[PDB]
């Protein structure tokens, strides 16, 4: 019953873009899908408020860092609420309890003998917020940039605590091979295994040139590497260091870390090493998703897609749908103003909206707003119902692999079958007929159409909560008839349906 799922927590240095929304909406779907399938869900999201990337942004505006971090964190939380993210905690690394969780992890790591003091010299990217070797850098017209990210970098000489990541090279490979579903998609798993197979170096995990961060226990001259306290948020969200609490007993180890492909090393290499050191159970699964481009990365150079405005321009549930359908989850895809509209027009307004409005209006005008009593199901009726009866298990299967796009595609294939069934059955002809065989068929074909629309509506709840709820409202479904257990219970004939209205204006 317990299920603990998390998102990456965002740098509140600038405003959110669609990519941030992509990850919160995707993770929200999974969360809502589990709640509807009788799971006890915990859903963590939040912001990563420390580090030099955020401090140098507050210096680029005139405001203290804490204030920039607080204010821009509100903007991230306000954005998530606007997109209807059902998170159970919005964590912020400035929270006092997170300060204590981070300090305990350090203790257990130092007590295991995996932390040692030494001099560090190397090339640090503030944007990426990670260290680079001279080799993974290139000099371009007198500017020092990263070979992969092309990011600026600053030379740094400091005495810092290191982590014996070198001590965990082989345990990690062994864990990777005994836990095949630990990293997904498979392409990314192969990439982590290759990196670790080449050997790991020890990792600087503290800083002395600035104090914006969590205070290293018994060493105020140091603050933790921002990624060390950032990864800890997944423990903080479960009640650590109170490992005897109800929260930590049932929710840790986390079932699923949702992240983007650029931060996999921190989650699949560093994070499990830190937990083996501190004697803590590892997460069960990390799924790294792709990046959303615009026609072109999303650079503050003038190419940002604002998710709140995107939602105001087209609706919350329309954006959530397009993001989880347009892009095979796990691959890289791109946004375009034209692709979102055509997608919405063909998939929501027509393929699903018409089928629901056309069927719900015949019930209003010809059957006195009551679900009709169906007769015997012909071979066309039962085979359509069969398709819709077997969806829950196909869709569940897809959600378990993080393929929401294939879950949606499956729902729409049935809807296509439903429209094509609506056309071969021509129920608008039978309504007029005074014969009794035509009427019963009219009553039967209309029930079948409403019934499969009700199943779709239920299965759509995780992606389009509001619209699905609207459709179920128009189908006379009560508030306790909206779990996945209701999928297998047939629409009750004769229920009073309210007068139909547009779901996708
Ligand atoms: C303990 S976790 C700390 C994480 C760290 N604080 C951090 O990396 O912060 P972040 O704000 O820059 O990125 C936050 C998340 O959004 C993703 N992301 C970023 N741009 C994206 C895009 N264009 N498309 C899809 N996903 C994207 C990105 O891959 C990441 O998973
Ligand atoms: Mg963008
Ligand atoms: Mg397609
Ligand atoms: Mg997707
Ligand atoms: Mg299938
Ligand atoms: Mg009749």
Q: Where in the chain is the domain with CATH 1.10.730.10?
A: 336-505
SS (H, E, C) 139-162: EECCEEEECCCCCECEEEEEEEEE
Question: Which CA distances in Å does 320 have to 293, 317, 397?
Answer: 16, 5, 20
Which residues are CB-neighbours of 327 under 8 A, at least 6 positions away?
Answer: 290, 292, 333, 405
Yes or no: domain 1-113+227-335 corresponds to CATH 3.40.1360.10: no
Is the shortest distance between the CB of 268 and ligand 1 below 6 Å?
no
- Measured between alpha carbons, how far is 67 from 171 in angstroms, rounded to an integer? 42
Partners of 41 in beta bridges: 3
Nearest ligand (C-alpha, residue 54): 1
The closest-lying atom of ligand 1 relative to the alpha carbon of residue 230 is 1
What are the distances in angstroms from CA 404 to CA 338, 339, 393?
Answer: 22, 19, 13
Q: How far apart are CA 192 and CA 203, in angstroms?
A: 17
Instruction: Say if residue 3 carries a ligand binding annotation.
Output: no
Best CA proximity match to 307, nearest among 83, 8, 72, 70? 83
**Cα 473 to ligand 2 centre (Å):** 35
Closest ligand by atom to 413 CA: 5
User: Rounded CA gap, 340 and 332, in Å?
Assistant: 16
Q: Which fold has domain 336-505?
A: Isoleucyl-tRNA Synthetase; Domain 1 (1.10.730)
Q: Report the distance separating Cα 258 and Cα 288, nearest Å.
A: 6
The closest-lying atom of ligand 1 relative to the alpha carbon of residue 298 is 23
User: Ligand 1: which residue has its CA nearest to atom 7?
Assistant: 10
Q: Where are the beta strands (DSSP E) in 210-365?
A: 223-224, 256-260, 286-289, 292-294, 333-335
Answer whether 226's CB lies under 8 Å from 114's CB: no
192 Cβ closer than 6 Å to some ligand 1 atom: no
Cβ–ligand 1 contact at 28 (below 6 Å): no
Which pair of structure tokens corresponds to residue 489?
């219970």
Cβ within 8 Å of residue 90, ≥6 positions away: 45, 46, 47, 77, 80
Q: Which residue has tokens 């074909």?
A: 445
Provide CATH 3.40.50.620 ranges for the chain. 1-113+227-335
All residues with CB under 5 Å from ion ligand 5? 394
- Please name the residues in contact with 208: beta carbons below 8 A apart, sequence gap of 6 or more: 158, 159, 160, 221, 222, 223
* CATH 2.170.220.10 residue spans of the chain: 114-226
Q: Could you tell me whether strands 143-146 and 137-140 are parallel, antiparallel, or unpaired per DSSP bridges?
A: antiparallel
Residue 298 is labelled as binding a ligand: yes
Does residue 292 have its Cβ closer than 6 Å to ligand 1?
yes
Supply 315's token pair.
């609706």
Q: Which of 180, 212, 209 is nearest to 193 (CA)?
A: 180
Q: What is the dihedral of CA 453, 456, 462, 466, to 10 degrees?
A: -10
Ligand closest to 372 (CA) is 6
**DSSP at 387:** H
- What is the residue with the minimal CA distance to atom 13 of ligand 1? 10
Of the candidates 89, 108, 114, 79, the residue with the CA atom closest to the CA atom of residue 307 = 79
Q: Rounded to an integer, what distance in angstroms lies between the CA atom of residue 15 and that of residue 7?
A: 17
* CATH level 2 (architecture), domain 114-226: Beta Complex (2.170)
46: left (phi over 0), alpha (psi -120 to 50) or beta: left
What's the CA dihedral at 459, 461, 467, 470 to 10 degrees? 80
Residues 156, 31: Cα–Cα separation, whole Å: 42
In this structure, what DSSP letter does residue 190 have?
H
């Amino acid at each position: 019953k317990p299920y603990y799922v998390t998102t990456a927590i965002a740098y509140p240095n600038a405003a959110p873009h669609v990519g941030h929304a992509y990850e919160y909406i995707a993770t929200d779907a999974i969360a809502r899908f589990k709640r509807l399938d009788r799971y006890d869900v915990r859903f963590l999201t939040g912001t990563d408020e420390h580090g030099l990337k955020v401090a140098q942004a507050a210096a680029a505006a005139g405001v203290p860092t804490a204030a920039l971090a607080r204010r821009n964190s509100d903007v991230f939380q306000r954005m998530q609420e606007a997109l209807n993210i059902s998170f159970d905690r919005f964590i912020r690394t400035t929270d006092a309890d997170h300060h204590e969780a981070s300090k305990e992890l350090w203790r257990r790591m130092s007590a295991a003998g995996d932390i040692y003091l030494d001099n560090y010299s190397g090339w640090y990217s503030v944007r990426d917020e990670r260290f680079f070797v001279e080799s993974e850098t290139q000099l371009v017209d007198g500017t020092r940039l990263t070979v992969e990210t092309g990011t600026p970098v600053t030379w740094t000489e400091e005495q810092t605590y290191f982590f014996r990541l070198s001590a965990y090279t082989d345990k990690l490979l062994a864990h990777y091979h005994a836990n095949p579903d630990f990293i997904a998609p498979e392409t990314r798993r192969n990439e982590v295994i290759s990196f670790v197979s080449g050997g790991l170096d020890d990792l600087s995990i503290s800083r002395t040139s600035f104090d914006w961060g969590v205070q290293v226990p018994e060493h105020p001259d140091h603050v933790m590497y921002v990624w060390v306290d950032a990864l800890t948020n997944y423990l903080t969200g479960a009640g650590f260091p109170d490992t005897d609490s109800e929260l930590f007993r049932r929710y840790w180890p986390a079932d699923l870390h949702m992240i983007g492909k650029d931060i996999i090393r921190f989650h699949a290499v560093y994070w499990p090493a830190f937990l083996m050191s501190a004697g803590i159970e590892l997460p069960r699964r990390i799924f790294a998703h792709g990046f959303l481009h615009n026609r072109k990365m999303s650079k503050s150079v003038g190419n940002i897609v604002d998710p709140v405005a995107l939602a105001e321009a087209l609706g919350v549930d329309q954006v959530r749908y397009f993001l989880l359908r347009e892009v095979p989850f796990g691959q890289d895809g791109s946004y375009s103003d034209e692709a979102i509209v055509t997608r919405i027009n063909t998939d929501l307004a027509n393929e699903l909206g018409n089928l629901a409005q056309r069927s719900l209006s015949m019930v209003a005008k010809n059957l006195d707003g009551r679900v009709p009593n169906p007769g015997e199901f012909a071979d066309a009726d039962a085979a359509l119902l069969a398709t819709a009866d077997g969806l829950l298990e196909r869709v569940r299967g897809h959600f378990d692999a993080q393929a929401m796009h294939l879950a949606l595609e499956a729902i729409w294939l049935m809807l296509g079958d439903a429209n094509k069934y609506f056309s071969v059955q021509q129920p608008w002809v039978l309504r007029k007929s005074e014969s009794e065989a035509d009427q019963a068929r009219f009553r039967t074909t209309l029930y079948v159409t409403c019934e499969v629309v009700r199943i779709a509506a239920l299965l759509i709840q995780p992606v389009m909560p509001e619209s699905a709820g609207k459709i179920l409202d128009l189908l006379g479904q009560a508030p306790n008839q909206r779990s996945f257990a209701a999928v297998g219970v047939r629409l009750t004939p004769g229920t009073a349906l309210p007068p139909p209205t547009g779901v996708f204006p």
